[PDB]
Amino acid sequence: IVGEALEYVNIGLSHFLALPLAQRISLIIIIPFIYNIVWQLLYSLRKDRPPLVFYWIPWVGSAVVYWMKPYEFFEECQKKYGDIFSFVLLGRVMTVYLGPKGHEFVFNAKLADVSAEAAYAHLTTPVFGKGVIYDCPNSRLMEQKKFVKGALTKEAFKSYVPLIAEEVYKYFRDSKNFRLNERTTGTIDVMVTQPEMTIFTASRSLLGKEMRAKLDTDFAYLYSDLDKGFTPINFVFPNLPLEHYRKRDHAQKAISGTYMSLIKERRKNNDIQDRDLIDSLMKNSTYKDGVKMTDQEIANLLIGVLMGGQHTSAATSAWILLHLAERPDVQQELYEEQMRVLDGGKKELTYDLLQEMPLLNQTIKETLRMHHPLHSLFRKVMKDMHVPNTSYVIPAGYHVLVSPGYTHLRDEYFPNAHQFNIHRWNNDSASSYSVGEEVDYGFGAISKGVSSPYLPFGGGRHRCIGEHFAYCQLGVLMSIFIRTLKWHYPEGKTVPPPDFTSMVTLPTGPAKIIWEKRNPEQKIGGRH
Ligand SMILES: CC[C@@H](C)n1ncn(-c2ccc(N3CCN(c4ccc(OC[C@H]5CO[C@](Cn6cncn6)(c6ccc(Cl)cc6Cl)O5)cc4)CC3)cc2)c1=O
Ligand code: HEM
């Protein structure tokens, strides 16, 4: 008889339900804990799964170390397991593929195999609004990218350069961080100045003078609120009934409302020209199946483009200033190139003259090598994927993670990779360039291979379309900083370590530098 054992099964179950509440809470904790450990052990036997990083707390996984020190985590895993490994992250399984083959695996993955919008829509849809970027099918995103790129032409950059320059000068004139007409030296926190200079310059050029004027008002606080809603927390908790989440949603409505008002106002007056991204999207935002973007979708798209451009660029110019603050030799070299190309400062800066400043562009290029603003990009796996030349299968429901910024910092691809050296890019100062064959996913021909160890703008269908804008903006900005100021660290201070916990990787604050006018007597005109 085994029937009597099946009775004690039922009996055991009943005694289980009658345990003292202290013992039940205890078990409510210890049972998932034990089961988690046993599951990992069994998992480690499968030869069709990449090794999985061991973790103690269920669901949470390796969340804490990935959040604080993602590259140190990757290096340690790479040492133990090689280039492919998985780890658990707040309920998700992330399969990391390091190095250029990882780039190809993920960036050039078939559209059916992986989804960016499934990975990202929570990080962005609550902030930007509905119907755009990741809150739409991939083919809509492809065309949105085509639309936005339409305002990012050489001719647009030629007209943006003096607008960006004017904002930089105005910021030197009026901001309390500078006041160059009143002060000849001062101390700044670059994580205060660079986000402000970035939003002022990006607004003026992409959004136009009206939207720029708005930032001189209490309206600016809405950008602050919307900005605070752009946080890694959204990855897990995109909506919680806290005040944080409420100021964000309000801001999105208020800011999209303001863009819609401008859009409808311009159409009303037949005042649609070729000034900015707004004019461009009004004139050119009809999908190929004949559907037009709504005014709300246009406004939402504007928010997304400005927000993304805001954080990558601000972080980058902050890093440029910080690396140059201990490199007066590089400031000196950059200054000589400015003197040569602009004829001792007699020539006004133009987009065409920016292209003749290779060391300036190499400085941007080198900063983006050492400080990729996005340490990890990922996709949700939609169909089981076989890893070439292995036995691994990444099942649907997993996420794949790629990290070009990690490869940027490997000695094998960049000798002395932790040394800042703009000259590693001599005669190679282009922001990026296709090393051969090209393809077009709907927003223009881009490189077909994504095997370059240097990939600051990613690749494949989700590739950045902002790189020439970012270089234009960063170039104007740094050209003027260099011609106007010298700067250095307070005694004993040096380049800060990256903070990886925000949406882009920023310098750990407070990152202060001391500036000095190259020409103490130089005045900036205009009224204030
Ligand atoms: C346990 C709780 C707590 C301790 N914890 N523990 C771990 N974590 C955690 C770890 C990591 C992360 N991640 C989430 C993902 N993230 C990130 C990934 C991709 C990314 O952007 C890629 C896409 C989407 O956004 C943009 C960014 N961009 C690109 N160019 C310019 N910006 C983007 C593309 C297009 C447009 Cl229009 C806008 C935007 Cl924003 O590209 C941004 C951040 C890094 C941090 C979040 C939380 C926690 O919160
Ligand atoms: C230094 C500056 C920047 C860097 C390093 C950068 C980096 C990137 C990267 C790595 C991606 C690919 C993301 C992925 O594959 O998951 C991307 C995508 C994108 N970026 Fe940028 N970016 C920068 C600036 C900008 C700017 C200024 C804009 C807008 C003006 C912009 C708009 C976009 C857009 C529209 C995409 C496409 C998103 C998609 O197709 O899924 N970026 N960027």
β-strand 399-402 against 92-97: which pairing, if any?
Answer: parallel
Q: Cβ-count burial of 378 within 10 angstroms (0-12 exposed, 13-18 middle, 19+ buried)?
A: buried
Cα of 219 from ligand 1 centre, angstroms = 26
Q: Write the DSSP assignment of 482-501 as a string of letters.
A: HHHEEEEPPTT--PPPEE-S
Other CB atoms within 10 A of residue 384 CB:
13
Greatest CA separation for the chain = 103
Method: X-ray
Q: In the structure encoding, which two tokens stand for residue 294, read together?
A: 């709504």
- Per residue in 193-227, is it b (16+ CB within 10 Å) or e — as a string? bbbebbbbbbbbbbbbebbbebbeeeeeebbebbb
Provide the residue type at 377 as one letter: L
- Phi and psi based region of residue 350 (left: phi greater than 0; alpha: psi -120 to 50; beta: remaining): beta
Question: Is the distance from the beta carbon of residue 403 to the nearest atom of ligand 1 less than 6 Å?
Answer: no
Residues 6+ apart with CB under 8 A from 156: none
Other CB atoms within 10 A of residue 181 CB:
14
Q: Rounded distance, CA 67 to CA 54, Å? A: 16
Instruction: Give CA separation, 367 vs 316, 322, 337, 419, in Å.
Output: 7, 10, 18, 11
Q: How far is CA 527 from the centre of its chain?
A: 36
Q: Could you tell me where the beta strands, DSSP code E, fall in 232-361?
A: none
Instruction: Give all domains of the chain, ordered by start, each with its CATH number.
Output: 123-517 (1.10.630.10)
Question: Is the distance from the beta carbon of residue 312 to the nearest atom of ligand 2 less than 6 Å?
Answer: yes
Q: Rounded distance, CA 242 to CA 228, Å? A: 13
Q: Rounded distance, CA 461 to CA 242, Å? A: 36
Q: Specify the residue for token string 């932790």.
A: 418
Cα of 454 from ligand 1 centre, angstroms = 20
Provide the residue type at 384 as one letter: D
Q: Specify the residue for token string 């000849």.
A: 184
Stated in angstroms to one decimal place, the resolution of this structure is: 2.2
Question: Is the distance from the beta carbon of residue 120 to the nearest atom of ligand 1 less than 6 Å?
Answer: yes
Q: Cβ-count burial of 403 within 10 angstroms (0-12 exposed, 13-18 middle, 19+ buried)?
A: buried
Q: Cβ-count burial of 386 within 10 angstroms (0-12 exposed, 13-18 middle, 19+ buried)?
A: exposed
Q: What is the DSSP letter of 60?
A: T
Residues 6+ apart with CB under 8 A from 46: none
**259 in helix, strand or coil?**
helix
Residue ID of nearest Cα to ligand 2 atom 20: 464
C-beta separation of 97 from 429 below 8 A:
no
Question: Is the distance from the beta carbon of residue 404 to the nearest atom of ligand 2 less than 6 Å?
Answer: no
Cα of 457 from ligand 2 centre, angstroms = 6
**217 in helix, strand or coil?**
coil
Q: Rounded distance, CA 257 to CA 45, Å? A: 55
Q: Rounded distance, CA 171 to CA 195, Å? A: 12
Q: What are phi and psi of 321, to 5 degrees?
A: -65, -40
- Which residues share a beta bridge with 512? 189
Other CB atoms within 10 A of residue 93 CB:
19
Question: Is the distance from the beta carbon of residue 374 to the nearest atom of ligand 1 less than 6 Å?
Answer: yes
**228 in helix, strand or coil?**
helix
Question: Is the distance from the beta carbon of residue 458 to the nearest atom of ligand 2 less than 6 Å?
Answer: yes
C-beta separation of 487 from 513 below 8 A:
yes
Q: In the structure encoding, which two tokens stand for residue 182, read together?
A: 């009143």
C-beta separation of 421 from 122 below 8 A:
no
Taking alpha carbons only, the member of 264, 342, 252 closest to residue 306 is 252
β-strand 445-447 against 438-440: which pairing, if any?
Answer: antiparallel
Residue 145 in marked binding region:
yes
Q: What are phi and psi of 143, to 5 degrees?
A: -75, -35
Residues 6+ apart with CB under 8 A from 93: 52, 86, 87, 397, 398, 399
C-beta separation of 364 from 320 below 8 A:
yes
Q: Rounded distance, CA 431 to CA 457, Å? A: 9
Residues 6+ apart with CB under 8 A from 248: 126, 127, 225, 226, 228, 229
**93 in helix, strand or coil?**
strand
Q: Rounded distance, CA 479 to CA 320, Å? A: 12
Q: Rounded distance, CA 137 to CA 154, Å? A: 29
Other CB atoms within 10 A of residue 277 CB:
24
C-beta separation of 320 from 362 below 8 A:
no
Please report the atom of ligand 2 found closest to the CA of residue 315.
1
Residue 472 in marked binding region:
no
Q: Rounded distance, CA 143 to CA 379, Å? A: 20
Q: Rounded distance, CA 476 to CA 403, Å? A: 29
The residue length of the chain stands at 528
Question: Is the distance from the beta carbon of residue 53 to the nearest atom of ligand 1 less than 6 Å?
Answer: no
Q: Rounded distance, CA 197 to CA 203, Å? A: 10
Gyration radius of the chain over CA positions: 26
Q: What is the DSSP letter of 462?
A: G
Q: In the structure encoding, which two tokens stand for residue 89, read together?
A: 């992250």
Instruction: Give CA separation, 19 vs 10, 24, 466, in Å.
Output: 15, 6, 61
Residue 209 in marked binding region:
no
Q: Rounded distance, CA 52 to CA 61, Å? A: 11
Q: How far is CA 33 from the centre of its chain?
A: 35
Which H/E stretch holds residue 334? helix 328-341
Provide the residue type at 79 as one letter: K
Q: Write the DSSP assignment of 135-197 as a string of letters.
A: SS-HHHHHHHHHHHHTT-SHHHHHHHHHHHHHHHHHHHHH-TTT-TTT-SEEEEEHHHHHHHH
Q: Rounded distance, CA 407 to CA 390, Å? A: 21
Candidate from 464, 476, 504 with most ligand 2 atoms within 8 A of CB, to mutate: 464
Q: In the structure encoding, which two tokens stand for residue 349, read together?
A: 């800066």
**440 in helix, strand or coil?**
strand
Cα of 53 from ligand 2 centre, angstroms = 30
C-beta separation of 474 from 157 below 8 A:
no
Q: In the structure encoding, which two tokens stand for residue 22, read together?
A: 């202290």
Q: In the structure encoding, which two tokens stand for residue 65, read together?
A: 């170390």
Q: What are phi and psi of 261, to 5 degrees?
A: -60, -40
Instruction: Give CA separation, 295 vs 128, 148, 288, 300, in Å.
Output: 14, 15, 18, 9
Other CB atoms within 10 A of residue 167 CB:
24
Q: Rounded distance, CA 385 to CA 112, Å? A: 10
- Which residues share a beta bridge with 385? 394
Question: Is the distance from the beta carbon of residue 465 to the nearest atom of ligand 1 less than 6 Å?
Answer: no
